[PDB]
Amino acid sequence: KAKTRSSRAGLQFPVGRVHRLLRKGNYAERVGAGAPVYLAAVLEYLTAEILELAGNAARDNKKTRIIPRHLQLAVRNDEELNKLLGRVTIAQGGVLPNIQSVLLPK
Template sequence: MTSMDPMAYVITDRGESGKVKGKSRSRSSRAGSKFPVGRIHRLLRQGNYAERIGAGAPVYLAAVIEYLTAEVLELAGNAARDSKKTRIIPRHCNWPSEMTKN
């Protein structure tokens, strides 16, 4: 192809392998997480926590945050149900910590 050929500048969605790429997936969906892995990675880089941040660190941190959130919500939901309420309010989040202080 010559430089004047209009087909020389056609942009395709093929990589170096020559195969057509599928629909792009977020790192959160690949990791199976509800929390944003990309945003956590950006915040880790901007926060001066380390000179370099590995690719697995934000995935692991997102999983830990998701697990802790699920635990707190489960305990708060149980506290709301015990008090015959259908909505969780901040007071329900305090009850489990008060119950475990025995």
């Protein structure tokens, strides 16, 4: 019987899909047979690392549905996920609360 290529490596993200995208995206003339697996592992690691902080935020905000504001918080509150997404803008993410100290009353 068949056995999905993304299940032989303990991954959730599809490996046949990533392989077809690498093949038909015109990145190189030939694609190693283990490159899609590595890339899919890295993709699911990053998405889990951001979804975890998003869930932590949505829970510490007494909701139970991850929502764009929670992703904006999870990203801009980190320090390395902030450099990976320094140029992006997350639609409906608002901004991070911050007020300068020269402005706060004395």
